[PDB]
Design a binder for this molecule. Structure first.
Ligand SMILES: COc1cccc(/C=C2\SC(=S)NC2=O)c1
Ligand SMILES: COc1cccc(/C=C2\SC(=S)NC2=O)c1
Lengths: 327, 327
């Protein structure tokens, strides 16, 4: 960190939901997403160095595997943390990972390095940005399955709301900037896919402390500007992980804060490979030519959906390399 | 770090074989060794601060469980690494741990901090001590099951000797100090117990590069001065882990190196709880009173061995709190 005299500006890189280590459609045609994903991450890291960001915010789901992440996935994560730390201080709000050692590793790494901070509790942390700016981090991670295992919905809502009220109180005692970091699902998300075999946490967007200068959220795979006061953004994932994300905007966001003035932000589009679902009434020869000609010019991955039985289908996937799913 | 110019001294703390997380005699009377072990570790840390050591060497088997160490064990390990890093730079040569993430964690931690170094290959690493001394580390870790799985005794030994000769060559290109770090069993160890359910690596003490200023070894639970030139020491464990270690010396060592002068070292005794095996031919009333009177005054843990059947034994362990095993 430089010790440039405390300024009124704060340039922020905010990215999340990397899902490192993911292989899509493993039970039809496994496609390792690593090359496309690293291509998107390199784009984000390079853009941050170009824009000379002061702070880097990561808000979880950086690894696809919640249980046993591959050595390759863990290597890429620590690799990209290292590259970002060389650019600006990094604050990491991890997702709902399964092994408890992560909290000990995170606290240990936070203790031995000034360039990275792991926030894994509801307790706020003050950090210093690249140009000396003092930033109070208001963290709101995934609570617990155990407290959720209470099964009483009423008290669990009250637990979360009391944690939010405290973060509001501590945001008032800020110095230069206060930044909220949360890993949850905003209530009533326009076009929310749904639960992917798991219990989710639903928070009303109005409960986010209005006095924070920026609300950095993760867990949602599409870019979403939730609200303007306080500015609340899901950056989205960097790749289209599965079909259903065909219309999502993918990338990161660059946020600039000035005291007393409204915040400005630009999207950093990852330019991800596209997805396409092909719907056919029946798989006939006229529909077969449509399938082949489409994939020959389509730079992404294709799914074919049909309900009318069309006999034993010809080896479409053994023939078409970017056709990954037929259902 | 201080940068003392033309410094000919290097004060070293060398400890190893902590076995954090161990619970002894789990199949007779489980005794959690954590309190005694942290008591010994605190003693070592305090002495290092008193002597103001320049470098701290750890040579493996710091955790008892090679597979899934408890969260408590990992927390204690990271806790004591943190305390030692505040005193002096730390070089860590880990033992044969099982999960592959350790090398990624180690390299990541090494990259972000100048006060800790993980050496997990045969590749030498240069480090800076507390007062600016340049130290070349010659690491010789436990290889792998795979290269040992060659099963050809001739080639495997030649591989190990090739690595040792290479470490000798790079030790010649030293700057101020060169330190050998190895995790293996020296050949022909006077009173060596044997293999504790595992294939071990046997190295002749003469193969250690004679040009190093100090040879820091781990894996053996007893203090052992292997040779004088180069000075080669097993520090031993900090507690008496199981019966058979009753007569071992336990603790760490404080080593001082001076250019052109012979090295000096002192033992730092851990003052561990003693162990005692009571051997009786037959468990009679005279042997029963002997067992009770002995343990009442013995500050450590006691094992009772007898071969002649003596009927249903009275609840000796239900009476004697430090009687942990009857076999
Ligand atoms: C699982 O070992 C590590 C080590 C370092 C960082 C992370 C971060 C994670 S994992 C997840 S899900 N979201 C995150 O931000 C995980
Ligand atoms: C298993 O996670 C960690 C994390 C940091 C250090 C170690 C060291 C070890 S493990 C072993 S056996 N010997 C050692 O020195 C292990």
């Amino acid at each position: 960190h430089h010790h440039v005299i405390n300024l009124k500006e704060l340039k922020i890189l905010h990215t999340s939901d990397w899902h490192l280590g993911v292989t899509s459609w493993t039970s039809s045609r496994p496609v390792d997403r690593r090359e496309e994903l690293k291509k998107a991450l390199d784009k984000v890291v390079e853009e941050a160095e170009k824009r000379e960001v002061d702070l880097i915010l990561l808000t979880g789901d950086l690894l696809h595997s919640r249980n046993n992440p591959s050595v390759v996935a863990l290597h890429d994560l620590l690799d990209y943390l290292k590259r970002m730390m060389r650019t600006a201080p990094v604050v990491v709000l991890p997702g709902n990972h399964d092994w408890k050692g992560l909290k000990l590793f995170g606290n240990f790494v936070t203790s031995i390095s000034s360039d990275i901070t792991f926030v894994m509790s509801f307790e706020p942390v003050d950090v210093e940005a690249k140009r000396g700016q003092k930033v109070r981090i208001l963290p709101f991670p995934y609570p617990d399955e155990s407290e959720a295992l209470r099964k009483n919905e009423g008290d669990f809502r009250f637990f979360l709301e009391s944690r939010l009220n405290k973060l509001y109180e501590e945001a008032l005692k800020k110095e230069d900037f206060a930044i909220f970091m949360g890993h949850f699902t905003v209530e009533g998300l326009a076009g929310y896919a749904g639960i992917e075999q798991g219990r989710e946490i639903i928070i009303n967007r109005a409960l986010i402390p209005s006095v924070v200068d920026y609300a950095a959220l993760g867990h949602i795979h599409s870019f979403r500007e939730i609200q303007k006061q306080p500015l609340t953004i899901y950056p989205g994932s960097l790749i289209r992980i599965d079909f259903g994300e065909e219309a999502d905007e993918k990338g990161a966001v660059f946020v600039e804060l000035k005291r007393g003035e409204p915040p400005r932000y630009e999207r950093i589009d990852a330019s991800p490979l596209p997805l396409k679902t092909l719907y056919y009434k029946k798989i006939d020869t006229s529909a077969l030519k449509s399938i082949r000609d489409f994939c020959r010019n389509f730079p992404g991955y294709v799914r074919v959906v049909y309900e009318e039985d069309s006999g034993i289908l010809p080896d479409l996937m053994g023939e078409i390399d970017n056709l990954v799913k037929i259902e």
